[PDB]
Symmetry: D2
Subunit: 243 residues, 4 copies
């Protein structure tokens, strides 16, 4: 497969419907060796089942709000993977009240803080901690959403976190690039669904399978000439207007 011999860490697998599940699925098909992290114990047994299926034994706990937690997970990972080739950032979050209604009235200092810390910072937080472990030719991937670029109703402060994150992807790529590391993002279509379906050129919303293959590609040597790019896997929805 095109990921044959790559050891990739996969974050964010919460369920079978998770974009991370669709992404691991594809990296696996393409011969990548996977490892997974889980936020808390609620999800341990589940993530362990998913990993077993995708052939890995590496299921490490990791809460991205704690620097120390991230450090710890990279120590355990290190016991089996002294060197690896990148990870998949598929973490995002904001307190619920934040995401409904008028942005200006919904947003709060604490809400803004959490949204940027979990959704934007965690990406560089992890990069920072596994930087010396990464093999040349490694690639880091994160997921963004059109809300970073356009004002979308209800997405509110999650839109700023994603803008921050897309900038993160350009600064990380410029910093890590020289040492053989590429970093990009995939702005996925919504996985309202009806409207998108009708107004999207391909006339259908993407699936974690569509996003999965783009993720696999981007993390593989096939995309070697690509770094710092936010690739839209939304079926073209953002390029059309007034359809």
């Amino acid at each position: 497969g095109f990921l044959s011999g790559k050891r990739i860490l996969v974050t964010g697998v919460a369920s079978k419907l998770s974009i991370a599940y669709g992404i691991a699925q594809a990296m696996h098909r393409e011969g990548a060796e996977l490892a997974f992290t889980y936020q808390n114990d609620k999800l341990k047994g589940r993530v362990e089942e998913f990993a077993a299926q995708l052939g890995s034994d590496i299921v490490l706990q990791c809460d991205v709000a704690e620097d120390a937690s991230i450090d710890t997970m990279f120590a355990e990972l290190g016991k089996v993977w002294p060197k690896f080739d990148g990870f998949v950032h598929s973490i995002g979050f904001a307190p619920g009240d934040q995401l409904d209604g008028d942005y200006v009235n919904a947003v709060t200092r604490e809400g803004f803080k959490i949204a940027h810390d979990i959704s934007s910072y965690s990406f560089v937080a992890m990069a920072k901690a596994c930087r010396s472990m990464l093999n040349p030719g490694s690639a880091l991937l994160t997921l963004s959403y059109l809300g970073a670029e356009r004002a979308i109703p209800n997405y509110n402060v999650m839109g700023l976190a994603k803008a921050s994150l897309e900038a993160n992807v350009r600064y990380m790529a410029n910093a890590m690039g020289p040492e053989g590391v590429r970093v990009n993002a995939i702005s996925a279509g919504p996985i309202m669904l009806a409207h998108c379906e009708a107004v999207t050129p391909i006339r259908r919303t993407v699936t974690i399978e569509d996003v999965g293959n783009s993720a696999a590609f981007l993390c593989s040597d096939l995309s070697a000439g690509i770094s710092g790019e936010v690739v839209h896997v939304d079926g073209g929805f953002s390029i059309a207007a007034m359809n």
Copy 2:
């Protein structure tokens, strides 16, 4: 002038070199009535002197790091300007260690938090705090930089905060528009300089005059059709390549 009839609040004056000082002058020259803010004891005496030269005596303190400092300042403002036409938000901050060297090695969870808190959240926190006081036809303005769109060396976490900020401009613009408020941004060229003067289409870096003139317009009714935009006042530096 084209701002006569406008009561506008100007933040961020720290010196005669400050951008808001150039904005203040221009808004004053065009007929505006201004209110000023100073961050602390250190800057108070300096802001009061300029407000006097500009005919204003509305000089209030405001630490955007405190929601209470914000509410209280707008409460003192209501006592003199029950309603006004918008404010210029020319505040930005990142801890010393942040803007130096390899982005990834420099950035820290807290340097990140502070940079976003002060440079980005402070914008919406202020509109949040004064929404009711705004008149239809009101325009809010912020200041950003190219590092939001591109990875500029050493700008590091500030670039990410400028991205969150430009995203904030869109979401705020979209939410407030219905009540008669427009929200824009000026991505000003750096007021490196020699490289910019050599490669900028107009062949010179921009001045606080250039920036002030544009801010004055973005806050006047002359720009009634412009909302949610990030206007580049950098002499065309960003639209050139390998000059």
Copy 3:
């Protein structure tokens, strides 16, 4: 006014509904001295009447499809304005059959040629023809539309010509900048309308007044730091999504 001292050439007036008519008025209100152009016999009498109301009597013919029509018009201009401060290029054209239906089935090799020739090449062809006559501090302005950046139904080949046009603005801006000329563009909202009024942040389509006010500024020294930019005067319609 902010344009007093400016001698500016205005093209594209065909009626009181025309965009250049709104631009002309505003540039006149601000102190500008204007020269006008009409495309043909049909429009002559109409342009001459407005020029009279605006205090001008410099009404010259110009078919941008002919390099000779251009040279000759600028030759008659030199006889009254040996030098001037820029011109507004508000010309655009695509053969009937083009802007109707499936883009791919509509577009023809010649509809393409004409659309690009008149809507895009005519911009640089005019600056080419009057370069020597320009004063430092001179600003050139064109009009574009969102269909350049996004695929709008029925806009078809015109979208492609607007893209070539916006690209023309950058290249012209970069080449001419050193001599004191700035070159910008206004991407105006459509002067469909009901959909736009409902989804536009300011909740109303923009007027030729809104557009004129912005053009007047983009052609004044107040915008000295803005060159090679495409300013969106569409009430923020383009920065919103799924409103």
Copy 4:
């Protein structure tokens, strides 16, 4: 391979160094069945040798300036490929005088015409002619360059043609999307080379091999969720500033 069973037409193979050569190379490796076109007789024997190597027998003549020529080639192609799955547009052109020196002085009406017709129009010209032959799941690919988005010295009018072409890619995708056709572009880094090498994050220019794999991916079902996107395969050069 991921192109197993795809029949793709490849335009623009002029030499071993041609981006089209690097692209066919990769589609071949991935199991695609190729067919090639050649501009004129000068290149027939050569293109026939390249094709033989990549396992095809289909070497059709095609001059994109002639509608009739394009039609003819699709008739011959049709004899062997009644249905196929897309083509690779790797054609670009402008008269030489156009590409050196000051844009404004270099550009001409005829030069502009040719550059847009050959570089931009030909893409839709071909699409138009094979539209009923294309199989659902087909994909069309073209090559663009950063000159479309930034003002690059000497690229002059080629920059406008590419802007036109990038818009073409969005209008074609929106029109053909509903019938199961995706259309995208790859903005390739320069294949000055020294400067790019030093300022590009990956610290090296891309190769036709890097561009080749991205082309293969984009034309394969792996990229199914992608249409109307211009993907930058430039090693991140355009995302960084002032390195």
